[PDB]
């Protein structure tokens, strides 16, 4: 019980974290991926 | 019409030139207002200031 609610807060907290569009560098690599997708196909 | 055949040349002249001001602005943007406005995407503001 004590560690399935470590287990059940820390599921949240990455969730929580996920709400911000935070960019970076490996971006790039899948917006190459639109051009392959949506422009070259 | 001389004058007006000559003012076509002013528009791709000046067309021309403002390719100084983009890129200090470009790196204005990059060094700053995009990476202020939390990450996009292009920024409108920046392409209206330059405009």
Same mark, same amino acid.
């Given at each position: 019980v004590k560690h399935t609610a470590k287990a059940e807060n820390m +599921?949240?907290?990455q969730f !929580?974290? #996920?709400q911000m569009v935070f960019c970076q560098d490996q971006i790039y690599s899948v917006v190459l991926?639109?051009? !392959? #997708? #949506? +422009?070259?196909? | 019409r001389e004058d =007006?055949? %000559?003012?076509?040349?002013?528009?791709? @002249? %000046? @067309?021309?030139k403002?390719? %100084?001001?983009?890129? &200090?602005? /470009? &790196?204005?943007?990059e060094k700053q207002y995009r990476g202020k406005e939390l990450l996009? =995407?292009? %920024?409108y503001k920046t392409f209206e200031?330059? /405009?």
């Open positions: +599921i949240q907290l !929580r974290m #996920e991926k639109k051009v !392959r #997708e #949506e +422009i070259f196909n | =007006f055949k %000559n003012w076509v040349g002013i528009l791709a @002249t %000046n @067309t021309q403002v390719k %100084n001001i983009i890129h &200090e602005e /470009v &790196e204005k943007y996009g =995407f292009v %920024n200031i330059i /405009v």
